[PDB]
Amino acid sequence: GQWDRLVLNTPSFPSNYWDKFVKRKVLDKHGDIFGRERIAELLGMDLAS
Amino acid sequence: CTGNQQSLAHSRLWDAVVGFLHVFAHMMMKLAQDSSQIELLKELLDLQKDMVVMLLSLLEGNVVNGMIARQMVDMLVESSSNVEMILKFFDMFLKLKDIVGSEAFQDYVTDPRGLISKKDFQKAMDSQKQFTGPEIQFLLSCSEADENEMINFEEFANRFQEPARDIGFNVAVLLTNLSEHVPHDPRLRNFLELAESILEYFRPYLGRIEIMGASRRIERIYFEISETNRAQWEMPQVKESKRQFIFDVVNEGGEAEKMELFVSFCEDTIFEMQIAAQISEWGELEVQRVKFLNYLSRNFYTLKYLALFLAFAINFILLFYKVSDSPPNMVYYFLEESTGYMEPALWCLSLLHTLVAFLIIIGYNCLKVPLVIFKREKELARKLEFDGLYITEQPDVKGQWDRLVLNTPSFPSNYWDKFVKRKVLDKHGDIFGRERIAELLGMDLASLEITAHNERTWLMSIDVKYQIWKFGVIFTDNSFLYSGWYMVMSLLGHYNNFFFAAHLLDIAMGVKTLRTILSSVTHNGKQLVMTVGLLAVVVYLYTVVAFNFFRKFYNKSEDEDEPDMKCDDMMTCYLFHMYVGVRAGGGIGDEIEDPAGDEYELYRVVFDITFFFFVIVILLAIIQGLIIDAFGELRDQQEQVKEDMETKCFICGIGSDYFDTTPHGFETHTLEEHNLANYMFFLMYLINKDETEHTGQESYVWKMYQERCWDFFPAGDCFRKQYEDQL
Amino acid sequence: MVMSLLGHYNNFFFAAHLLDIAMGVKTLRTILSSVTHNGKQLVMTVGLLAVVVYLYTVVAFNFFRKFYNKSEDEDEPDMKCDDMMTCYLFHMYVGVRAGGGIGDEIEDPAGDEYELYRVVFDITFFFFVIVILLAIIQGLIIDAFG
Amino acid sequence: ELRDQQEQVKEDMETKCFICGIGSDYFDTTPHGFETHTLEEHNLANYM
Numbered sequence A: 001g002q003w004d005r006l007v008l009n010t011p012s013f014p015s016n017y018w019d020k021f022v023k024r025k026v027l028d029k030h031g032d033i034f035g036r037e038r039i040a041e042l043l044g045m046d047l048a049s
Numbered sequence B: 001c002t003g004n005q006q007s008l009a010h011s012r013l014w015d016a017v018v019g020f021l022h023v024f025a026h027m028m029m030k031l032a033q034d035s036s037q038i039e040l041l042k043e044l045l046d047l048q049k050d051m052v053v054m055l056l057s058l059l060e061g062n063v064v065n066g067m068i069a070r071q072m073v074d075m076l077v078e079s080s081s082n083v084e085m086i087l088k089f090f091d092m093f094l095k096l097k098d099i100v101g102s103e104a105f106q107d108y109v110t111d112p113r114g115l116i117s118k119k120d121f122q123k124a125m126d127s128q129k130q131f132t133g134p135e136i137q138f139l140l141s142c143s144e145a146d147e148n149e150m151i152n153f154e155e156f157a158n159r160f161q162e163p164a165r166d167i168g169f170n171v172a173v174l175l176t177n178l179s180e181h182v183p184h185d186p187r188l189r190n191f192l193e194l195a196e197s198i199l200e201y202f203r204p205y206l207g208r209i210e211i212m213g214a215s216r217r218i219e220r221i222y223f224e225i226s227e228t229n230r231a232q233w234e235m236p237q238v239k240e241s242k243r244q245f246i247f248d249v250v251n252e253g254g255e256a257e258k259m260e261l262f263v264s265f266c267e268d269t270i271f272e273m274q275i276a277a278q279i280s281e282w283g284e285l286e287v288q289r290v291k292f293l294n295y296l297s298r299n300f301y302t303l304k305y306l307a308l309f310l311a312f313a314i315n316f317i318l319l320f321y322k323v324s325d326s327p328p329n330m331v332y333y334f335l336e337e338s339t340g341y342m343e344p345a346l347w348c349l350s351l352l353h354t355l356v357a358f359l360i361i362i363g364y365n366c367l368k369v370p371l372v373i374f375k376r377e378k379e380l381a382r383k384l385e386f387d388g389l390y391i392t393e394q395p396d397v398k399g400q401w402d403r404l405v406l407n408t409p410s411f412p413s414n415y416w417d418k419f420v421k422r423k424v425l426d427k428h429g430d431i432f433g434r435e436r437i438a439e440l441l442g443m444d445l446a447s448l449e450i451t452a453h454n455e456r457t458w459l460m461s462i463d464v465k466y467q468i469w470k471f472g473v474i475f476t477d478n479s480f481l482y483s484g485w486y487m488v489m490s491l492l493g494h495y496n497n498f499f500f501a502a503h504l505l506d507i508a509m510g511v512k513t514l515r516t517i518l519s520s521v522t523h524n525g526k527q528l529v530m531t532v533g534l535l536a537v538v539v540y541l542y543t544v545v546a547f548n549f550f551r552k553f554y555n556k557s558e559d560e561d562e563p564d565m566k567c568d569d570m571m572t573c574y575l576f577h578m579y580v581g582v583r584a585g586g587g588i589g590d591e592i593e594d595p596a597g598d599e600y601e602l603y604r605v606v607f608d609i610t611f612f613f614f615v616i617v618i619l620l621a622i623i624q625g626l627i628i629d630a631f632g633e634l635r636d637q638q639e640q641v642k643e644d645m646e647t648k649c650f651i652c653g654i655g656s657d658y659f660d661t662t663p664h665g666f667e668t669h670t671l672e673e674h675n676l677a678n679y680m681f682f683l684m685y686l687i688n689k690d691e692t693e694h695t696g697q698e699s700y701v702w703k704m705y706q707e708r709c710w711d712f713f714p715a716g717d718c719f720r721k722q723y724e725d726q727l
Numbered sequence C: 001m002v003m004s005l006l007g008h009y010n011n012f013f014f015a016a017h018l019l020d021i022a023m024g025v026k027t028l029r030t031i032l033s034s035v036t037h038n039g040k041q042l043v044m045t046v047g048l049l050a051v052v053v054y055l056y057t058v059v060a061f062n063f064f065r066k067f068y069n070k071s072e073d074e075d076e077p078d079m080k081c082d083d084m085m086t087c088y089l090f091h092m093y094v095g096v097r098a099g100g101g102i103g104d105e106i107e108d109p110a111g112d113e114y115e116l117y118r119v120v121f122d123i124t125f126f127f128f129v130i131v132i133l134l135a136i137i138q139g140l141i142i143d144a145f146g
Numbered sequence D: 001e002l003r004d005q006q007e008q009v010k011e012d013m014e015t016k017c018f019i020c021g022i023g024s025d026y027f028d029t030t031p032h033g034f035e036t037h038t039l040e041e042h043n044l045a046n047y048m
């Protein structure tokens, strides 16, 4: 897990996977319990707004 | 008793309860709006705690689908709109503590005093999307204004939590009892999701259990588990006893004592949890002695690594002694290639290990001795005052040495029962002379001291024979004897520094596999001593054939005159044969002479080849065989246990089969229904009540425990059968 | 790949590319996996087997030392139990490997001096190191394979 | 093997009736069931 922290902010993280919307999945699922500006900075979603 | 529970099921008692349900949902939500109203509201919660326990005791002796259960649920839905208002009050005042624990609102306050602003904390609850619009003004009205900038979220969290603690657990019991009792009620399915937060805050503190009493029916029994009972259960010093207790019960213990050992193990755990709670963090003196023994016991398992790494360190340095004819008779000096203070380093390392071994010997005497002495004294007291060990029959070296404890006044003084003297006296003082058995027990003022309690520094005290008896029984513990050998050789290590080489063997005595090899050498080696006894007889019958006949052959004549003989004195030749015979690979022939001189040759050649086959290729293999196979079995028994515990209930008598015809069936049967741990916990609850608060089953299991009959354990079912179908 | 390029430094390092034979053909991999899997539980046996030879090498250093000698000829009297760091070694170079335990590589306890004790020192070596321990080890491997 | 046959017997006699044809199963669904079946009902000694 500790080595895989560096992949949470590349834009081509799921790029060798069939699902590409897993960023919006956990954002729209957990963006209300925490600050959705924080978890977007955890994921690096550019132009999230 | 059904005859009351039928009459209560036919009055207007529900219509009494419905009126109590309507006054409860409205009194709180009015009384929650002041600080000067809180004295009254604690009384109200304790009232409805006592109301729902009447509902629970009404719902005992309950069948899975019975009309008492069905009259319970529609009365809850005839009283819907208020019972969610009490449910939402529990639901809102529980997430309030979990929300305020988040840092998003500690960032929303900028006051260093902590006095969070009201509208600031209003938008804080508006930021999270779990509460509602009317909730925050209900919470703002619940808050103190204090110039509209101070709600003090810390005290506001726990103010309405501790008085609401037991009742919020208790209402979750009744909801989860009925939902587990009757299936297919969507109103209950509406209820359970409406009260989800009070379930998960009160699922870890809850415990379930299933006993079978009251004319062949198993039923779910429920209870409270404290934070304190679960805190000192998940300790490794408790857990190490549990892993051993798993082993020696399912391996060599039969199905009969497996409950009797279990409650003994359960009785074993309460003592050591008590003694771990005892040590939990001129005049004077007491303070120093207490603080010292606490720190020593606290280390113990961490202290022992220091002893081992010191024995490695001194021994590695000690692997440099050299002998010379002339000192720089013969002297044993040290090499010291670098660090010419390396001999002073060894000298310091020796002291430190002997003190550390002393600090282990003393710490063992406050995390062992009370457990083994309690275990003997309880076993003796129960097995006496029940079977009559020392009054009806007579003995065993465990019994013969324990005769000296029958007359100390502080015999049960490291046990919870202290009235076991009056127990067996009032039970057996009529069959024999009660003046005699009192003299057997030494009850001073047996005619006088009983009625006085009715109507109304030499080692600190002055103890004697009970300490001598304690010192004998602790000296008899195999693990104390080992640690005493380790201490003994440490001080003997100051006579000659090389004796610290014996402290190296501790490596074999701890690390599992190693202990398995030595236990293999010992266990089957008791049956092996007859093989090496037979192997002596063999070499011996060989050493006579030679003494008599072939002797000219057996000779080590170095040169002419020098003709060392071997088969002249037998006492030697048997020896010779055992010094070169058994060890040579080529049996014996190798160490003698070619049967060139036909004289007997054929016979001589038969004498060797027979040696071979027998001693070197057969016997000397059987021996290896024994050891290897012993090791193998050892490894196999360890295996077994594992499988077994992963293929049976350990509480009821059904494997992972009936409980397997369903997704993660077994687990659910273990982690919720039958958790050996549960059957334990249950007991400290039982133990810590008052006997006047025990329910029906709670007094029923207690009074069967207090005479040690064990028929309340299920042994054949688990609702999955008694009710199998209907569910 | 690494050893292939290292094979251009000295052509003999292509001898290490032969071991690929063991790494593919089922049975072979089973033997090496047996040496590795139970061999994690085995390192404590050879850790125990070190402690054994070591407790033997002190009994000698102190007492029987006159016996341990390889004096080729008169003056030439190579000694073995003078410097311990060596004798533990000696014992591990001829002791564990000789079939006849240790006695084979020293001298007859002719001089009764301690003899009985000397004879007990060897026969105990035998049983322990050569006939018990050195078999347990084999045992581990064989059973793992099994 | 020798050592294993000696084992066997033991188990067997501690897992069957030796008189009727039922192991410690039907006679196991009850506290100390087997024993009672042996020491009172089916005691080889009795049949003697």
Ligand SMILES: CNC(=O)c1cc(C#N)cc(C)c1NC(=O)c1cc(Cn2nnc(C(F)(F)F)n2)nn1-c1ncccc1Cl
Pocket (backbone or CB within 6 Å): B301, B302, B304, B305, B307, B308, B357, B360, B361, B482, B483, B484, B486, B487, B506, B507, B508, B509, B510, B511
């Ligand atoms: C023998 N048992 C004993 O209780 C014992 C009694 C006395 C006395 N008086 C003194 C010591 C040193 C004891 N020994 C251990 O206490 C012990 C030994 C090992 C195995 N050993 N082999 N290899 C390895 C290692 F090198 F890898 F560390 N360790 N573990 N172990 C261990 N267990 C739990 C906690 C801490 C330890 Cl240190």
Ligand SMILES: CNC(=O)c1cc(C#N)cc(C)c1NC(=O)c1cc(Cn2nnc(C(F)(F)F)n2)nn1-c1ncccc1Cl
Pocket (backbone or CB within 6 Å): C001, C020, C021, C022, C023, C024, C025
């Ligand atoms: C080790 N595993 C590897 O993947 C491997 C990795 C690298 C790299 N970089 C290089 C090589 C050569 C590798 N080796 C094999 O690839 C291989 C070895 C064997 C067993 N070996 N033993 N005896 C026999 C024989 F002599 F009878 F042929 N073969 N089979 N085998 C095999 N398997 C499937 C397809 C083809 C083969 Cl050649």
Ligand SMILES: Nc1ncnc2c1ncn2[C@@H]1O[C@H](COP(=O)(O)OP(=O)(O)OP(=O)(O)O)[C@@H](O)[C@H]1O
Pocket (backbone or CB within 6 Å): B243, B246, B645, B646, B647, B648, B649, B650, B651, B669, B670, B674, B675, B676
């Ligand atoms: N009533 C039971 N039925 C079946 N198996 C059980 C039962 N109780 C305990 N076990 C088994 O024994 C274990 C319980 O304690 P154990 O120490 O053996 O392992 P663990 O609980 O899973 O891990 P740990 O206790 O170290 O966190 C379970 O993992 C489970 O495999």
Ligand SMILES: Nc1ncnc2c1ncn2[C@@H]1O[C@H](COP(=O)(O)OP(=O)(O)OP(=O)(O)O)[C@@H](O)[C@H]1O
Pocket (backbone or CB within 6 Å): D013, D014, D015, D016, D017, D018, D019, D037, D038, D042, D043, D044
């Ligand atoms: N009908 C039976 N069913 C099951 N087991 C039996 C039966 N009869 C005898 N046994 C077993 O064999 C034993 C009977 O005699 P055995 O000599 O083998 O041991 P023991 O009777 O318990 O001890 P001892 O006879 O020496 O006092 C019982 O212990 C019991 O284990």
Ligand SMILES: Cn1c(=O)c2c(ncn2C)n(C)c1=O
Pocket (backbone or CB within 6 Å): B267, B270, B271, B274, B416, B687
């Ligand atoms: C007070 N007390 C008991 O009452 C008890 C017990 N074990 C069983 N019981 C009943 N222990 C350890 C105990 O301390």
Ligand SMILES: [Ca+2]
Pocket (backbone or CB within 6 Å): B692, B693, B694
């Ligand atoms: Ca009562």
Ligand SMILES: [Zn+2]
Pocket (backbone or CB within 6 Å): B649, B650, B651, B652, B653, B654, B669, B674, B717, B718
């Ligand atoms: Zn079960």
Ligand SMILES: [Zn+2]
Pocket (backbone or CB within 6 Å): D017, D018, D019, D020, D021, D022, D037, D042
């Ligand atoms: Zn039968």
